[PDB]
Amino acid sequence: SISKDSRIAIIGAGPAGLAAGMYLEQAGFHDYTILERTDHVGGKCHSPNYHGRRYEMGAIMGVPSYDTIQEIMDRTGDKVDGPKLRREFLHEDGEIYVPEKDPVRGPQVMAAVQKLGQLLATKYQGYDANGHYNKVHEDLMLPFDEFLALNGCEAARDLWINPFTAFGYGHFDNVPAAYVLKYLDFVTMMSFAKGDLWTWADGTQAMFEHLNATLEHPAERNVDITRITREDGKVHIHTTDWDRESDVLVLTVPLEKFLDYSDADDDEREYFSKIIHQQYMVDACLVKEYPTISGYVPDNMRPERLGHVMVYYHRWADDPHQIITTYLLRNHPDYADKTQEECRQMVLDDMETFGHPVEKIIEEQTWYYFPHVSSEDYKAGWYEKVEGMQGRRNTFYAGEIMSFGNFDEVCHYSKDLVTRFFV
Ligand SMILES: Cc1cc2nc3c(=O)[nH]c(=O)nc-3n(C[C@H](O)[C@H](O)[C@H](O)COP(=O)(O)OP(=O)(O)OC[C@H]3O[C@@H](n4cnc5c(N)ncnc54)[C@H](O)[C@@H]3O)c2cc1C
Ligand SMILES: [Cl-]
Ligand SMILES: [Cl-]
Question: Which of 52, 166, 279, 282 is within CB 3.0–4.6 Å of 330 for a Cys-Cys bond?
Answer without folding.
Answer: 279
